[PDB]
Coordinates of C-alpha atoms in Angstrom, one line a residue:
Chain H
X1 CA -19.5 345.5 -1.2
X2 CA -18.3 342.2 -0.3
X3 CA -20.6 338.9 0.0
X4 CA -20.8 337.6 3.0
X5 CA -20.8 340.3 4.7
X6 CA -19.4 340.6 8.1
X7 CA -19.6 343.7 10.4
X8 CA -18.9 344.6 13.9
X9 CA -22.5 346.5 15.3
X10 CA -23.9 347.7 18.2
X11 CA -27.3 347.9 18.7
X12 CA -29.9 349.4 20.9
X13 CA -34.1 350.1 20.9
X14 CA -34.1 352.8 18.2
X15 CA -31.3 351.3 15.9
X16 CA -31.7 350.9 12.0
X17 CA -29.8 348.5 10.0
X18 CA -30.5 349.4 6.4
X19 CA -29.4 346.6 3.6
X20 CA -29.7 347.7 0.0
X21 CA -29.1 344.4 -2.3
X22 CA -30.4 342.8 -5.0
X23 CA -31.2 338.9 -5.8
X24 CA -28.3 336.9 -8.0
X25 CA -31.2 335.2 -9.8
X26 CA -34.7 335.5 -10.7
X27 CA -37.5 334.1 -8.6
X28 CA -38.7 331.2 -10.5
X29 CA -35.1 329.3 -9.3
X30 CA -35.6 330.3 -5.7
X31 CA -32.8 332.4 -4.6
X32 CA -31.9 333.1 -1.0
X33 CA -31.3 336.3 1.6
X34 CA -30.1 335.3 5.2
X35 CA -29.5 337.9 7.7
X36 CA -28.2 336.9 11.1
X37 CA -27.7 339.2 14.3
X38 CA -24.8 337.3 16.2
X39 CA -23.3 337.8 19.7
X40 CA -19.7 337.6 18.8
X41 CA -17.6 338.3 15.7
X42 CA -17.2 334.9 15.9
X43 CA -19.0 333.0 12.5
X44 CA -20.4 329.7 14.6
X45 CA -21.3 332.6 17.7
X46 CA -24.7 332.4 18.7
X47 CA -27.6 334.3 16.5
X48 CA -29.9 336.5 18.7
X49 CA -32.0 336.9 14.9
X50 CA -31.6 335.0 12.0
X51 CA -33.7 336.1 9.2
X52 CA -34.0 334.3 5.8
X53 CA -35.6 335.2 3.0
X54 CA -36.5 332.7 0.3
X55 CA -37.4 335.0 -2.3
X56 CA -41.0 334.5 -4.3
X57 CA -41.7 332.0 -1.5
X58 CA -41.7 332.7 2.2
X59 CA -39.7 334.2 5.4
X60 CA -38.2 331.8 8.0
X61 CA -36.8 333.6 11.3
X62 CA -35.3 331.8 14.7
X63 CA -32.8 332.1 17.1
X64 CA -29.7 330.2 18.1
X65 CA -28.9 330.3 21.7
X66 CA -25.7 327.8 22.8
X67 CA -25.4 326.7 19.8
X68 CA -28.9 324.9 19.2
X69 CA -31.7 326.7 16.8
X70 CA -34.5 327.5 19.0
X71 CA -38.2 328.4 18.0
X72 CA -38.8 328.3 14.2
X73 CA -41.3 330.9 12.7
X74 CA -42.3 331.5 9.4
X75 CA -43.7 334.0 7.8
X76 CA -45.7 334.2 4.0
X77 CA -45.4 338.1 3.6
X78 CA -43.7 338.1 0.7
X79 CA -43.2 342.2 -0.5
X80 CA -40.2 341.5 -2.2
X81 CA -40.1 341.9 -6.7
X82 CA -38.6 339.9 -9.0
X83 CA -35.2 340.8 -10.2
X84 CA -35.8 344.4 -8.4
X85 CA -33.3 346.1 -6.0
X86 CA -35.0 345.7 -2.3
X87 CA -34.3 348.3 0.6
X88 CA -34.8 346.6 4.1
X89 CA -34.5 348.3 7.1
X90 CA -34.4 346.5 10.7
X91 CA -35.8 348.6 13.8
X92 CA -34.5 347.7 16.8
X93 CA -37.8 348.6 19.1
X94 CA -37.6 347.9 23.1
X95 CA -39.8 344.6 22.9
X96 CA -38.8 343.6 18.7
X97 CA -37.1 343.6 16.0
X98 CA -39.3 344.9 13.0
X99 CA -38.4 344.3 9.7
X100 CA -39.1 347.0 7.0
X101 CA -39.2 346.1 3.5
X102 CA -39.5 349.3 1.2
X103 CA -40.6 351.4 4.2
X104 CA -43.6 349.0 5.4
X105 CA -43.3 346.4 8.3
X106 CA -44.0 343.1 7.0
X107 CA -42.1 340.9 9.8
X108 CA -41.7 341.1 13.7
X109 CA -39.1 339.2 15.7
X110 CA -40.0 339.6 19.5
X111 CA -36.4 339.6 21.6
X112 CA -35.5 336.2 22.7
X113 CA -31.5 337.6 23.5
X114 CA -30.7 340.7 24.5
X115 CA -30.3 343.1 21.8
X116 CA -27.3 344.7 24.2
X117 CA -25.9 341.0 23.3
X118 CA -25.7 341.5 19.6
X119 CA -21.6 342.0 18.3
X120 CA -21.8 341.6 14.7
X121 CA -24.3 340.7 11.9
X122 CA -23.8 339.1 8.6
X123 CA -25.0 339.0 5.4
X124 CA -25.5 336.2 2.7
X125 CA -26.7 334.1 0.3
X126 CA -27.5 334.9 -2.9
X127 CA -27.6 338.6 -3.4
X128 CA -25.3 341.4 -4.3
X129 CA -25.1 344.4 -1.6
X130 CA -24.4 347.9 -2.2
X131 CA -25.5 349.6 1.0
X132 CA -25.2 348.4 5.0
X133 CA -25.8 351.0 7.1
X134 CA -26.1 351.3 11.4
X135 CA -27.8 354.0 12.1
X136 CA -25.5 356.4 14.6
Chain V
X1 CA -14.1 332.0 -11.8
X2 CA -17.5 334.2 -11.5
X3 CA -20.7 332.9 -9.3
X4 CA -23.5 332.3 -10.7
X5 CA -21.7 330.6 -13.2
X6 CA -23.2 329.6 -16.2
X7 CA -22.0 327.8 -19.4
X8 CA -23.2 326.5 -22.4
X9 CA -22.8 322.7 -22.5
X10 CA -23.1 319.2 -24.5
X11 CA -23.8 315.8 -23.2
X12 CA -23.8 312.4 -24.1
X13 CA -23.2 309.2 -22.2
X14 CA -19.7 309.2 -21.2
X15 CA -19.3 312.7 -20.7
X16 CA -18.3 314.1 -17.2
X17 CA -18.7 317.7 -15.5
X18 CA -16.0 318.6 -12.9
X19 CA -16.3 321.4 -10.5
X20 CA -13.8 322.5 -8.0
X21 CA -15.0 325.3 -5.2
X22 CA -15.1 325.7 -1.8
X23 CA -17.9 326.7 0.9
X24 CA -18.3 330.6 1.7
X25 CA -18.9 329.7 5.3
X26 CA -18.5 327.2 8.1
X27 CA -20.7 324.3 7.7
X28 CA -22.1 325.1 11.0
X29 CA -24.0 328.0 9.3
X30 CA -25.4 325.6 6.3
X31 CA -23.5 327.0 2.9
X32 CA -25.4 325.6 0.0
X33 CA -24.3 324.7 -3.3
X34 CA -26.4 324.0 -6.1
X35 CA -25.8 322.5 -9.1
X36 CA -28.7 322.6 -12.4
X37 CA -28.8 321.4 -15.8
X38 CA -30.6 323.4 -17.5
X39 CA -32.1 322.8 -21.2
X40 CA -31.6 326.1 -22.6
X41 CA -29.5 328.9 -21.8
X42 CA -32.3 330.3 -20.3
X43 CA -32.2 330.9 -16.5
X44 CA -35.8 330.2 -15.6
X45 CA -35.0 326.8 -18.6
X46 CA -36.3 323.3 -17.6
X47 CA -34.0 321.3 -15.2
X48 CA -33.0 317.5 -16.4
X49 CA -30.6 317.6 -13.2
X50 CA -30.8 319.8 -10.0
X51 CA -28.6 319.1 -6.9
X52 CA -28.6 320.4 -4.0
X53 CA -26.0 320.6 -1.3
X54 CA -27.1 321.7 2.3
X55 CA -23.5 321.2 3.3
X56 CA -23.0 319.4 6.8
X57 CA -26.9 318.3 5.9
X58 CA -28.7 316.5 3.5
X59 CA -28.8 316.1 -0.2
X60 CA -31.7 317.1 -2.7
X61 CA -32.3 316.1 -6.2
X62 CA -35.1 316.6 -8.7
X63 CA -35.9 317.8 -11.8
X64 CA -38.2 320.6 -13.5
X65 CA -40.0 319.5 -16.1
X66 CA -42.6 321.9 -18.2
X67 CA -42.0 324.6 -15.1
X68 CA -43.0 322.5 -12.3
X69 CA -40.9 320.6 -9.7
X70 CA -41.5 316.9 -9.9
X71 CA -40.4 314.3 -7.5
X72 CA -37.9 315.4 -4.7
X73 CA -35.3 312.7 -4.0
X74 CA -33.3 312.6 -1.0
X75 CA -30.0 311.1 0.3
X76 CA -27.9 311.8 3.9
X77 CA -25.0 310.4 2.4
X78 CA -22.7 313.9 3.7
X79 CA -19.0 313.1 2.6
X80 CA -18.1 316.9 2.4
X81 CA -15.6 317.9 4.6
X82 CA -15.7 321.0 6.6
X83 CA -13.9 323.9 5.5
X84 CA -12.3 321.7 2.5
X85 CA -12.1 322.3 -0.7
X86 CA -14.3 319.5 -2.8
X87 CA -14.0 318.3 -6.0
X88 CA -17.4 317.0 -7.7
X89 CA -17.3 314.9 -10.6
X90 CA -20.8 314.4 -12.0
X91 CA -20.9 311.1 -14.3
X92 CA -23.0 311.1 -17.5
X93 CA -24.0 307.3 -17.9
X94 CA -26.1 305.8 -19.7
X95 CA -29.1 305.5 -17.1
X96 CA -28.7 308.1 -15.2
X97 CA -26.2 310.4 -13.6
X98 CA -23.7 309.5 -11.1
X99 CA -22.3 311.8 -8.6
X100 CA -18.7 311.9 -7.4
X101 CA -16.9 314.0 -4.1
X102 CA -13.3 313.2 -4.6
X103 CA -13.6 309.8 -6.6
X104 CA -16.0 307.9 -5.3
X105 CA -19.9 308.1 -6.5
X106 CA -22.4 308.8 -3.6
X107 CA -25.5 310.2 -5.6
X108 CA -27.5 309.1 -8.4
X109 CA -30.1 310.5 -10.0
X110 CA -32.0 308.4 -13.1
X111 CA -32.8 310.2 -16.4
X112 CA -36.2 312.1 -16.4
X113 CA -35.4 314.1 -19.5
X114 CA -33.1 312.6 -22.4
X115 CA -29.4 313.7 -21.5
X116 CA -29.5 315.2 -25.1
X117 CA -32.0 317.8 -24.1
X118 CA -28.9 319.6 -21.9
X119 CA -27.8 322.7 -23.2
X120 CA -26.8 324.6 -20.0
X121 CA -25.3 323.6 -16.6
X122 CA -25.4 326.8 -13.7
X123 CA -23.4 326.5 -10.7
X124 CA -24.2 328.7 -7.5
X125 CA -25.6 329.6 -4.0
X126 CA -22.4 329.5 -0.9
X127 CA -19.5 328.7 -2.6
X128 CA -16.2 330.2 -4.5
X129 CA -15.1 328.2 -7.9
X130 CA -12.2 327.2 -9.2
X131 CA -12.9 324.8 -11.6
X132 CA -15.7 324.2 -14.2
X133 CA -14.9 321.3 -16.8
X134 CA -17.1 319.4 -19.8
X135 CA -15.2 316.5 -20.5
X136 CA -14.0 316.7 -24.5

């Protein structure tokens, strides 16, 4: 599976999107894991929920709405394990996005774009990928 | 050329390590590239020299010294081009290193640990290589 990964979605309340990946690097050197929820196919498009992980560390997650990052929040819920493969899964629920890690909600986005808005999402940074799955 | 990419390397004053790549993504979205030399082969190693790249951004240098980051230096100077290809020359002199994008120095970074002491050099986050060279 190729890294960035870029994929036409669409996405309503009871939508998964399952990522199965694991870091390049260990945690001591920091690696990265950004998830972003755009509005067109478009790379520079708008992100209705960027999500970036900085592994051993902390979660940053924000919004970028005409092209200007909006709101900044950050999270310390760090789940993740060195040098292990993670499963997240993102929920799509009516009032959030809820992000799984492992099965267990550690992170909550509340909708500041329509999800109905969302087009495409990419992955990156600094993980290898062997699953990306919408649910149907 | 594989990333992460790490080699086993020997400096002295005089010597210079050239790497050719090019950002994954549009600048817009903040591709990082990062650039560490390492004392042993050893990922999680000490780090005489650590660069970082937020491209479109900022600059960060430091070092890691016994495990522990020690004092962050900062520069804006930004002469990365968008969507360009970049070659980085970095300068081993005698006082410290020098940084080059395309010929002309715009970072410096003064020795912390003796050059001597470098036995690795790992290059990695948003970009695709083409060129890793240790002067002869």
């Amino acid at each position: 599976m190729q890294v960035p990964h870029t994929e036409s979605v669409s996405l309503s309340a009871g939508s998964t999107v399952t990522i199965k990946g694991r870091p390049l690097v260990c945690f001591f050197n920091e690696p990265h894991l950004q998830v972003d929820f755009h509005t067109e196919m478009k790379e520079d498009s708008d992100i209705a929920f960027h999500f970036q992980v900085y592994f051993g560390n902390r979660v940053v997650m924000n919004s970028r709405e005409f092209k200007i990052w909006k709101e900044e929040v950050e999270s310390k819920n760090m789940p993740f394990q060195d040098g292990q493969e993670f499963e997240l899964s993102i929920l799509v629920l009516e009032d959030k996005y809820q992000v799984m890690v492992n099965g267990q909600a550690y992170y909550n986005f509340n909708h500041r774009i329509p999800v109905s808005s969302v087009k495409m999402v990419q992955v990156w940074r600094d993980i290898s990928l062997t699953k990306f799955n919408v649910s149907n």
